[PDB]
Amino acid sequence: YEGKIINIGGTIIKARLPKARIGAFYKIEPSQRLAEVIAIDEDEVFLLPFEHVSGMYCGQWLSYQGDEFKIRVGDALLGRLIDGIGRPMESNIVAPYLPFERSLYAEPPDPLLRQVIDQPFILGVRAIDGLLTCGIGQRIGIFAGSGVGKSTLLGMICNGASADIIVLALIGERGREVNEFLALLPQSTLSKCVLVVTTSDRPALERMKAAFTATTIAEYFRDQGKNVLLMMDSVTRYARAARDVGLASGEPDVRGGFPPSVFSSLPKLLERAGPAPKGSITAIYTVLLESDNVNDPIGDEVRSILDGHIVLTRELAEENHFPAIDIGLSASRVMHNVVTSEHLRAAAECKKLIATYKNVELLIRIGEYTMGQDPEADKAIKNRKLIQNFIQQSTKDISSYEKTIESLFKVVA
Amino acid sequence: EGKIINIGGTIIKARLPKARIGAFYKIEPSQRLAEVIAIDEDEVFLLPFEHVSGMYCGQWLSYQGDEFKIRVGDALLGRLIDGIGRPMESNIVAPYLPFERSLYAEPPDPLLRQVIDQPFILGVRAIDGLLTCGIGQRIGIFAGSGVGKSTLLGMICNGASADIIVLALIGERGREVNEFLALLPQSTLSKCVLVVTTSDRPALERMKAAFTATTIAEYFRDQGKNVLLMMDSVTRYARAARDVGLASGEPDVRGGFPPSVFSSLPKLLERAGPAPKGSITAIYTVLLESDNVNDPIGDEVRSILDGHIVLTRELAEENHFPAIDIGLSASRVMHNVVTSEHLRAAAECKKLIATYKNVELLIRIGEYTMGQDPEADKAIKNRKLIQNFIQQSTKDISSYEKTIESLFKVVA
Amino acid sequence: EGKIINIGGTIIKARLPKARIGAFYKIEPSQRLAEVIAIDEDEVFLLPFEHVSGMYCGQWLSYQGDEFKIRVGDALLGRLIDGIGRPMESNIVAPYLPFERSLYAEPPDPLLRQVIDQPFILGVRAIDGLLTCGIGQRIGIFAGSGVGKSTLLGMICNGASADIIVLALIGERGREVNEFLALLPQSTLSKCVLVVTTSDRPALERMKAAFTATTIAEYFRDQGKNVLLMMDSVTRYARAARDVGLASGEPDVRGGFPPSVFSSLPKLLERAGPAPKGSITAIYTVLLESDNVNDPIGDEVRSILDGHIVLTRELAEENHFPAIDIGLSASRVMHNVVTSEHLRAAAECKKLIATYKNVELLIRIGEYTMGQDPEADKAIKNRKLIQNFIQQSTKDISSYEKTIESLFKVVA
Amino acid sequence: EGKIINIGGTIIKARLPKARIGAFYKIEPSQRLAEVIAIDEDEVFLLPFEHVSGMYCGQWLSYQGDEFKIRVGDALLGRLIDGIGRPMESNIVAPYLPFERSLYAEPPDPLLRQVIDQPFILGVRAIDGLLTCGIGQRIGIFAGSGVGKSTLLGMICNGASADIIVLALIGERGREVNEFLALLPQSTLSKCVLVVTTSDRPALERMKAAFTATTIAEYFRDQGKNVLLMMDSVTRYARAARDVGLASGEPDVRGGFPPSVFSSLPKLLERAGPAPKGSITAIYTVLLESDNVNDPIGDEVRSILDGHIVLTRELAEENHFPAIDIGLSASRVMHNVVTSEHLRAAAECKKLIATYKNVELLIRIGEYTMGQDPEADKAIKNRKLIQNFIQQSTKDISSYEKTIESLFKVVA
Ligand SMILES: Nc1ncnc2c1ncn2[C@@H]1O[C@H](COP(=O)(O)OP(=O)(O)O)[C@@H](O)[C@H]1O
Ligand SMILES: Nc1ncnc2c1ncn2[C@@H]1O[C@H](COP(=O)(O)OP(=O)(O)O)[C@@H](O)[C@H]1O
Ligand SMILES: Nc1ncnc2c1ncn2[C@@H]1O[C@H](COP(=O)(O)OP(=O)(O)O)[C@@H](O)[C@H]1O
Ligand SMILES: [Mg+2]
Ligand SMILES: [Mg+2]
Ligand SMILES: [Mg+2]
């Protein structure tokens, strides 16, 4: 009725329709599909469709629906799967009564009301609780290459950790995995868990807005006053989708691909999940790196945004050192507040023992090390197979927080 | 009805008013085909099905349908298919196929995938004992050029018992069609469809042949069969899509490639997996732009598939065949498939392989004294047993039971 | 017929309507031709055959034929052709060449090719023994500059015994025509066709010489006789196609090269090989842009040809001539054309060379004792035999039987 | 004529209708020529080199010729010529120079350019006895900085056996050219024709100095003499051509260099070889560095020339002048310009050089006893005579029969 699509191809369509707001969405009038206005020029506007672009033609009419895309949240979506758009995935069910219609884009808390985090958030993995340590309210990231340990360690964390609500966002990832995450979490955890699932075949928009859907649901269950655990698998899939949308809309190319929209819109998403006046969100974001280098565009940006980073190395997965986290290269920015002085000092001594062996390792292999002429090299060797049973852990094992402390005190001696 | 206004070398563009995207057209005097890929308000970019030599400005385009659909049916078993669905072998009669299928279908719904828990034996001892294939697992074979990819698919063509074998040979040597017909017996060739487009063929016909292989494998999946799909150098599809996507005016997001080859590789690889009715277990061969595993398409296909088998050139020069690097290889479902003593025997064997590659320069130069480290002596004493368990000739196939009993014997 | 509106150094833009792509035109005040590459509405982008340095704006184009066709006949034997197709011998009267045909031809059908199982005796002893070649395959010589490619083609040209030999010299040192013409006797020159372009010649004639050499070789193939196409530096064709593609407005995708180079190599290299009627055994040399085999164009030619002889500079400096590195090299038909104990002996001789290369540090500074590895003691005992087997001089030639019995002698 | 439309900083545009390409136009306020490089419809591109700042919108041009020409003649001996072709020494008058050559000629017909057969006498005992030059060989000396390039190069100037030497110095400074030409006497400046352009001159004149020296040496070839051309620093020819080609607007293909540099080096240094009348024996210089390792100009120059000399650094940090490392350097045309006994006596000395290198790094750690090998002990007894034969002072010139008999008394 209003405008006409004049340009079809790639990821974005372009239509002639005047007096368009930005962000408002539009039904393709003979086709039931609908599209969001992402960028406006004088009379031609860039739209981004929700579905496939095939089948369209020039002059196809474009009706009007709403001024902002909002999702529909409620208390009645625990234990239930949600799409990236906001719809429920499963069709066996009777549809819920979700009463509260929330906008997708919202504001972080005031920086003066976000209190200092000083309570440890127990995950269950011995390395990431003993050496590094989380806190109720931080947002930690898991940095790895392709197929190293990210989804296996996030499954261990979801198995071991406990929170009032658990929001788990499987964005950009293979469809085989939505049943493995429903398999390894129990019935009591499925009583309090919302999955937000977007497979990698889905369009740019669903794979781009599923992260904002999961963050909005976590903010809703925060505002009731509950400690909610957010877990987002491959936030770099959001980054790739924002890349190809922003490049198709005609933007420049800074820091290896990646328009300014990506690096300017990551903190508008990652700053929304932390401590708050009522409740808190403990977010865990996994990051895929374009090589094994940690110094990616997106890897370095997300490392400079978050509150702690767990870097997993492929060269430790070649040796079956699982979980493959690299202790010298990873860090946790709040463990000096959330734990006492004995644990922090013992963790410091164990980290320095690991780095000391990593310096001593190569000249043992080619056969030039001499015992006796260095007191702290031998101390890093005499303990080494004792510390590795603390630093590497089976998948079907959870560890208590007091066994972790006593194991670290026995290791560090 | 409209007329061509330029020819660019890869794609053409034309003055078609109000044309559908995806629709294909006949170039009216000379009997060829092209299809719409982009629209600029009256000027459509078209990708021709053939070579572009001979064309001129003002050449008409008659209309033929809204979608290039292939003619599929049950009489494809035992015969060879061109990259866009046509039969190749002119020696025999044209087959009769009843149904039409488009090349672009949706993956099965993620709630209906039913996590894979049954082993798929291959015949290679390294991808039985130390890696293990599930029925529904999609696997990749990552190597450089001439490292052993095709040799290993030839090993696991006559070793894997599946109901329908749909083999795609996109972007490779014309000489090989006969060699992959000289490794398959008639008890295998009677159930094997062999889709093949070679390196000569146009960029559309190497782009749109992996979709033909997946569509045929989905027709044989929906009947209820366990299909074994296997493609040769899916990076030839990736390079054809690079060429067309750069000719159509897209940027260069990573290592040479447009974003549309990164966003259209999952919606080909995600269709081959476990399903409610039937299953497709697929094996994708991936060529790397060097011997680095961190190629862009190598990295993306490693982050899509359910298992990667990395073959290195170093082991090929060492005459260690098949050249599988056990450290860089992984199978994402081995633990859901094998028994637990099998799993810990596999982990101990990979520990022994890594420990020998630690202590090898310590024993060769002469500093390793026999008795210092209580795992390196295990590795040294079991080196040759591990090595003739890992290596295998092309015409030797192993079963599952003999492989795991030799694994238990070698690892302890 | 049309004027010229742009002259750009390589691509000139004529304003002439209804022009067919592939057609060539004359610049009518002169006798120099130009071939159409791309078109627009009424502006065709075309490439001149000679250099561009004498042209002005309004300069007409007479129409010549719609495709560029060389004239081939049976009287090209013993002649000298350039990359356009003209004779170079002014001292000899021009022959009678009744047929004409275009330079762009499809390969044989992939099923009408056959599995090659007959050896091609080169004469070089190392290649014949350890690596070996089949009648109808495409071997490829990879080296640096000045490592010894050309010398090995001269050796392999005196030694081989094909019916017709079509030696192409593309983008090469003009001094060498008489040196490749002096190592041939008259008994081989009477059956050999020689196609010579030079590094001085422009980016079309250096680009079009490979296609005319392969067209002449396909003519003598279609007469039904085993021909031998030897091509000197096919990478000069790759450089010329890079310049033509980048002048025509193509993007870099890998190492400086456009997509059109990587799309135009496989059809050139894939029209040679087996055939229903005859065979065309091809030996291509590839100049790697440094002394490394992971050149973009070196890797893409290795992933097309079936077999590769990788020469190294570290052996050429140490007077290991010819400088074939036996570990880096391969031949994809070795297992198929020769007997089984020959395959076993060659495989463990290659393994013996590799296991000396992983020992010799223990010998140069004294860390090796005799009786702990009997294979290594046998290797150190037999190295003088083997480096009197791998090395041979240029005028040395050995038949196939003496090569096999010397291999059986050299590894016992 | 026409006037300047705009100046885009480096390249300028001017409306000259029906203006050819290659032509040179005269700016009307000053004495500054400029070159057309690309032609549009009625608005040609045009390239200034001297000075850009004092320019208008409306500054005029003036037509001179079809393209640029220089004045060659027999009275060029003992001169200094600019890269334009102007005589640099203004203290004398340019004599009756009657002939009129262009800068761009073709190399001879390769059938007429016949095999090079007789040795070129050079003077330096290393390049004359161990390696050997030829009459028509294009030697390229690879030097560092501080190895003794200019002193050796002056020995080549003075000790040569050629009728005319032609010297070009392409990128150099005034102290550098004066300290070079103050090393060779008036008896050598009688036959020499210096073509000097320095590192303050614009890049067009440094690019044209190579062509100017080549053309005047071809003129001295066509009247039947042995020309000895010496381009100093083709590295800086390549830097000048890179800067011109990038300023014209041309894509980077390899290491910072446009396609025009890589396609302009063969048509430069193929012109300097054997000929049907006379011959020109060329010797180029490339400056290799220690901050690069690839240096694409060094690789391309090594691919186009035939025979190269590597001047290493540590052969100068212990004062071994001339600093030629035999075994790292080689000449191709040696086996047909030397006799057989001189060939076998030359290979023996380089075998002894490599042999004492091996035995010396064996013995200086302490793993050698005197008495192992007679090739080692003959190397021991002949080291002082080898190092006495290779070492040659700045004033010492030897003949060729003395060189052969000194080689025969160093082979013993
Ligand atoms: N802690 C671990 N224990 C056992 N296996 C592991 C562990 N971490 C990684 N792996 C092995 O590595 C493979 C790939 O890990 P995955 O979690 O799928 O990577 P991604 O980070 O890409 O999702 C898994 O199949 C797994 O078997
Ligand atoms: N198991 C094996 N036994 C013997 N040779 C092998 C084996 N695996 C690889 N090769 C060698 O590698 C060659 C080329 O491998 P191929 O599979 O054709 O490479 P690509 O991966 O490029 O298709 C084989 O012809 C053979 O020479
Ligand atoms: N088999 C050999 N025996 C002795 N010398 C050789 C041999 N092969 C090459 N060489 C030396 O190497 C030089 C250059 O080899 P060539 O093949 O011309 O290099 P390119 O590969 O660049 O053409 C030759 O002049 C020759 O002296
Ligand atoms: Mg994952
Ligand atoms: Mg293959
Ligand atoms: Mg050569």
Residue numbers in the entry:
A (entry chain D): 34 to 446
B (entry chain C), C (entry chain B), D (entry chain A): 35 to 446
Sentences from the paper on this structure:
Substrate selection occurs in the cytoplasm and inner membrane, mediated by the export gate subcomplex (EscRSTUV in EPEC, and FliPQR, FlhB, FlhA in flagella) and the cytoplasmic ATPase complex (ATPase EscN, peripheral stalk EscL, and central stalk EscO; flagellar FliI, FliH and FliJ, respectively). The T3SS ATPase homologues are made distinct by their homohexameric construction, a presumed ancestral precursor to the heterohexameric rotary F1/V1-ATPases. The ATPase has been proposed to specifically enhance PMF-induced secretion efficiency, as well as to play a role in effector targeting, release from chaperones and unfolding prior to secretion. Each EscN monomer displays three sub-domains: the N-terminal oligomerization domain (residues 1–102), a cluster of curved β-sheets; the ATPase domain (103–372), made up of a central Rossmann fold with seven parallel β-strands flanked by four α-helices on one side and three on the other; and the C-terminal domain (373–446), made up of four helices lining the central pore.
The EscN-EscO complex was subjected to single-particle cryo-EM, with 3D classification resulting in two primary classes that refined to high resolution. Class 1 (58,000 particles, 3.34 Å) reveals a homohexameric EscN pore lacking visible EscO density, while class 2 (55,000 particles, 3.29 Å) looks similar but with additional α-helical density for approximately half of a single EscO molecule resolved. The final refined model spans residues 35–446 for all chains, excepting unresolved loop 323–329 on chain NF. The EscN hexameric structure shows marked asymmetry, with a prominent cleft between chains NA and NF. The N-terminal domain is largely static between subunits, with approximate C6 symmetry around the pore axis. Aligning each EscN chain by the N-terminal domain highlights a key pivot point between the N- and ATPase domains, with the ATPase and C-terminal domains essentially moving as a rigid body from subunit to subunit. Subunit NF, the most dynamic monomer with the least resolved density, is tilted back nearly 30° relative to the most inward angled subunit ND, indicating impressive motion at this pivot point. In four of the six EscN inter-subunit active sites, the Mg2+ADP-AlF3 transition state analogue was clearly visible; the resolution was insufficient to differentiate between AlF3 and AlF4, so AlF3 was used as the more abundant species at pH 7.530. The EscN active site location at the subunit interface and key motifs are conserved with the latter, including the P-loop (residues 179–185), catalytic glutamate (Glu206), and arginine finger (Arg366). The structure presented here shows that EscN can adopt similar C-terminal domain conformations; the lever is closed in nucleotide-bound sites T through D′, and open in nucleotide-free sites E and E′.
